[PDB]
Amino acid sequence: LCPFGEVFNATRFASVYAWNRKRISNCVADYSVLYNSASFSTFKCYGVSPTKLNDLCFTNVYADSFVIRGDEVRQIAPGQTGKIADYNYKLPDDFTGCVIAWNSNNLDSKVGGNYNYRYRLFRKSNLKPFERDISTEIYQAGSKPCNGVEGFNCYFPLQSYGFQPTNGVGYQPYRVVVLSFELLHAPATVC
Amino acid sequence: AIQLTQSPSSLSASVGDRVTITCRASQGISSYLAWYQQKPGKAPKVLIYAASTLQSGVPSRFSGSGSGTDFTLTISSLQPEDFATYYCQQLKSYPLTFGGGTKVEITRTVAAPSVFIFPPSDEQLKSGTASVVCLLNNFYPREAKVQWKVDNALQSGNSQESVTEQDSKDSTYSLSSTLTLSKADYEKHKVYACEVTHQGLSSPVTKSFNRGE
Amino acid sequence: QVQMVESGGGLVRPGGSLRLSCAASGFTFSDYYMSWIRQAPGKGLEWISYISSSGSSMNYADSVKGRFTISRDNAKNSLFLQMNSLRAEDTAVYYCAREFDLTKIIMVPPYWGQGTLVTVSSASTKGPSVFPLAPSSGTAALGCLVKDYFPEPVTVSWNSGALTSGVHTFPAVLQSSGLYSLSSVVTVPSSSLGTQTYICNVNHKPSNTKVDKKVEPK
């Protein structure tokens, strides 16, 4: 007996550049009758077959969770480009597993805007697959420095989300869950 | 935390001179500087941003100058409407700061005052208080003194005074010469006068009306 | 067509609270680092606070830190201020400015809305009384008079706006009665003394007293 259907059933995720991650082992899950609650706007696969794992065992099963905007849905894919895929959370080219999301505008779009969830609009370079630069450094867009102040070409790196409910779907808050794996060379833990 | 050396604080110019404003700065802000003109009470407006570039539709006479910490604003040929108070703004760090404010004038020839005289209105009188009012308009310079000669017994200490800002049109002022009295003290008298003494009034001249036309 | 609109000034008792509003359009609002400014009557202008493009970061000037509240609505193009536990010195004319565009990196000429008067006092509010001044004489001239309103402001306008030539708006000559009297008056071609009609356009909005008066002689 193992409790998988937990975090998406939970209420408030982390902002996308602050993506919460769970390592799961010593477990056993239902990958189908939870999928067959297929009210997820988006679901498609890059590692293994869709829901044919229910008798398959793993070393590591991973589940990062965050909230993006609706347009920002497209990004959570091996080989993607943009302030979400480059600066916030990169999926590798060798990605093993899949992703689910659903419209949380119902839940996580506060009337003045969920000014809580945020993303890193700005990084010097681009983060590696599975990287989380939760840095507040006042990004130097311009040559003259910031020293820790906001100002011209000296901007706060993380832009807020401001999920007003009226938004186009592009900006309704989609609650996202990734399923990586590092099943190799350890006990048979997750089936 | 970048403070601005608005230089100078006040000035006055003969019409169509070249004038120049320094704005030294407590930091090195690079070219992060805009220059604004504020007609009396209205909102400010940009005239130079990026410390050198002209705003759209502005005339060319305004010349943006500076880099580092010393900054200069040049006017080519000063104009009678350019009467304003002026502010440069630092734009580098978000503690957002200005210069103390260069109040700026026009030096026009001495104009002659224009003086009409008006009664208390019938609306005015019937309220319970009656007010007499004397006119100053389109004159230069603004310095002058007025006198209320009621019954020829002059009234000291019932006079409220406002002055217009210098005409942005043609650099000439105007002043409010209010009288304040109750209806009875308005009716006690019969002769009501108002006397004007300006520099360009080669001799002083006077307007008047008698309570009861 | 760059546009900004302050609205929400007037009287507020000190220790009570007020709220300002800056409606915008003409540019793309959600791009710009927004900010407010206030000027003590006649005195130097003072930046008071800002807000990020995304609302992700803001900060108040020290004279108001905490007591007031920046806020922007990205989808209705509006910046706000909530002003609380007010003070007789918080009294100023409160501008808003459009400054920093992440859509570029280059200098944006900041745009300032026309401003708005906040006056914090507990001596409460009085409608004005409007009084004409009928012309007498070589080329004539006439104007109006307003008296006994509180607080500022009241509005210059003439002949339903059709007049801006020679309109001499007077500063509000405050009274012993602790109120404001003042007037705007205009030089008037003595020839049009029959062919035209002249009406002046007050607006004391804080007392909601908004009235028009005829000026004709005798």
C185, C198 Cβ separation under 8 angstroms: no
Cα B55 to the chain's mean position, in Å?
A: 25
Beta bridge mates, B179: B159
Helix (H) or strand (E) holding C173: strand C173-174
Q: CA C79 to CA C206: how far, in whole Å?
A: 22
Helix (H) or strand (E) holding A106: helix A105-108
Q: SS3 helix, strand, coil % of chain A, rounded to 5?
A: 5, 25, 70
**Residues preceding discontinuities in chain A at C–N > 2.5 Å?**
none
Pick the CATH number of C129-215 from 1.20.120.1200, 3.40.190.10, 3.30.70.580, 2.60.40.10: 2.60.40.10
Helix (H) or strand (E) holding C200: strand C198-201
Helix (H) or strand (E) holding C147: strand C141-149
Q: CA A107 to CA A67: how far, in whole Å?
A: 11
Cβ contact, residue pair B162, C173, below 8 Å: yes
Measured between beta carbons, which residues in chain B are less than 8 angstroms from residue A154? 93
- The angle at the Cα of B39, spanning B22 to B87, to the nearest 5 degrees, equals 25
Q: CA A71 to CA A57: how far, in whole Å?
A: 34
Residue with tokens 């536990």: C85
- First vs last Cα of chain C: how many Å apart? 47
Whether the CA torsion C196, C149, C37, B37 is positive or negative: it is positive
Tell me, what DSSP letter sits at residue A108?
A: H
Beta bridge mates, A24: A61
What's the resolution in A?
Answer: 3.1
| HEC profile of chain B | CCCEEEECCEEEEECCCCEEEEEEECCCCCCCEEEEEECCCCCCEEEEECCCEECCCCCCCEEEEEECCEEEEEECCCCCCCCEEEEEEECCECCCCECCCEEEEEECCCCCCCCCEECCCHHHHHHCEECCEEEEECCCCCCEEEEEEECCEEECCCEEEEECCCCCCCCCCEEEEEECEEHHHHHCCCEEEEEEEECCCCCCEEEEEECCC
Cβ contact, residue pair B116, C136, below 8 Å: yes
Radius of gyration of chain A (CA): 18
C182, C146 Cβ separation under 8 angstroms: yes
Measured between beta carbons, which residues in chain C are less than 8 angstroms from residue A151? 100
Sheet-wide strand order for B45-49: B10-14, B102-107, B84-90, B33-38, B45-49, B53-54
Q: CA C157 to CA C161: how far, in whole Å?
A: 6
Cβ contact, residue pair C56, A142, below 8 Å: no
B162, B174 Cβ separation under 8 angstroms: no
Q: CA A88 to CA A190: how far, in whole Å?
A: 28
Q: CA B63 to CA B42: how far, in whole Å?
A: 23
A27, A189 Cβ separation under 8 angstroms: yes
Q: How far is B78 from chain C (nearest CA, A)?
A: 22
Q: Where along chain C do the CATH 2.60.40.10 domains lie?
A: 3-120, 129-215
Q: CA B188 to CA B211: how far, in whole Å?
A: 10
- The angle at the Cα of A147, spanning A145 to A152, to the nearest 5 degrees, equals 50
Number of neighbours of residue A108 by Cβ within 10 angstroms: 21
Cα dist from C151 to C121, C124, C126, C127, C183, whole Å: 9, 8, 8, 9, 15
Does B30 contact chain A (CB < 8 Å)? yes
C94, C38 Cβ separation under 8 angstroms: yes
Beta bridge mates, A178: A99
Q: CA B196 to CA B173: how far, in whole Å?
A: 14
Q: How far is C13 from chain B (nearest CA, A)?
A: 24
Residue with tokens 């500022």: C152
- CB-side neighbour CA atoms (13 Å) of C92: 22
Identify whether B8 is preceded by a cis peptide bond (ω within 30 of 0). Answer: yes
Does B177 contact chain C (CB < 8 Å)? no
Cα dist from B132 to A84, B92, B111, B160, whole Å: 73, 54, 25, 11
Beta bridge mates, B134: B117, B177
Q: CA B128 to CA B57: how far, in whole Å?
A: 52
A123, A82 Cβ separation under 8 angstroms: no
Does B205 contact chain C (CB < 8 Å)? no
Domain enclosing residue A24, as ranges: 1-185
Residue with tokens 């008298």: B189
Name the residue facing A160 among C54, C73, C107 (closest C-beta).
C54
C115, C6 Cβ separation under 8 angstroms: yes
Structure tokens given for B33: 């500087």
**At A185, which amino acid appears?**
H
Q: How far is B44 from chain C (nearest CA, A)?
A: 7
- CB-side neighbour CA atoms (13 Å) of B138: 12
Q: CA B71 to CA C203: how far, in whole Å?
A: 42
C182, B162 Cβ separation under 8 angstroms: yes
The closest alpha carbon to B148, from B200, B199, B189, B114, belongs to B189
Tell me, what DSSP letter sits at residue A149?
A: -
Q: CA B32 to CA B51: how far, in whole Å?
A: 6
Cα A22 to the chain's mean position, in Å?
A: 12
Q: How far is B160 from chain C (nearest CA, A)?
A: 7
Specify the 3-state DSSP secondary structure of C205.
coil
Specify the 3-state DSSP secondary structure of C171.
coil
Structure tokens given for B188: 């006690």
Pick the CATH number of C3-120 from 3.40.50.10900, 3.40.50.140, 1.20.1050.10, 2.60.40.10: 2.60.40.10
The closest alpha carbon to C42, from A46, B30, B100, belongs to B100
Query: Determination technique for this PDB entry?
Result: X-ray
Structure tokens given for C74: 């990205």
Specify the 3-state DSSP secondary structure of C124.
coil
Tell me, what DSSP letter sits at residue A105?
A: H
Number of neighbours of residue B63 by Cβ within 10 angstroms: 15
Smallest CA–CA distance from C134 into chain B, residue: B118
CATH of the domain at A179: 3.30.70.1840
Domains of chain B: 4-107 (2.60.40.10), 117-210 (2.60.40.10)
Q: CA C86 to CA B120: how far, in whole Å?
A: 40
Specify the 3-state DSSP secondary structure of C17.
coil
Q: In this complex, how many residue pairs, one in chain A and one in chain B, have their CB atoms less than 8 Å apart?
A: 19
Give chain A's domain count.
1
The closest alpha carbon to A118, from A167, A84, A149, belongs to A84
Does C133 contact chain B (CB < 8 Å)? yes
What length does chain A have?
Answer: 191
Q: How far is A11 from chain C (nearest CA, A)?
A: 22
Cα C67 to the chain's mean position, in Å?
A: 23
Smallest CA–CA distance from C34 into chain A, residue: A151
**Looking at the domain assignment, is residue A80 inside a domain?**
yes
Q: SS3 helix, strand, coil % of chain C, rounded to 5?
A: 5, 50, 45
Segment 91-120 of chain C within 8 Å of chain B by CB: 93, 95, 99, 106-115
**Residues preceding discontinuities in chain C at C–N > 2.5 Å?**
137
Measured between beta carbons, which residues in chain C are less than 8 angstroms from residue B178? 173, 181
A132, A69 Cβ separation under 8 angstroms: no
Q: In this complex, how many residue pairs, one in chain A and one in chain C, have their CB atoms less than 8 Å apart?
A: 46
Q: CA A56 to CA A54: how far, in whole Å?
A: 6
Cβ contact, residue pair A113, C57, below 8 Å: no
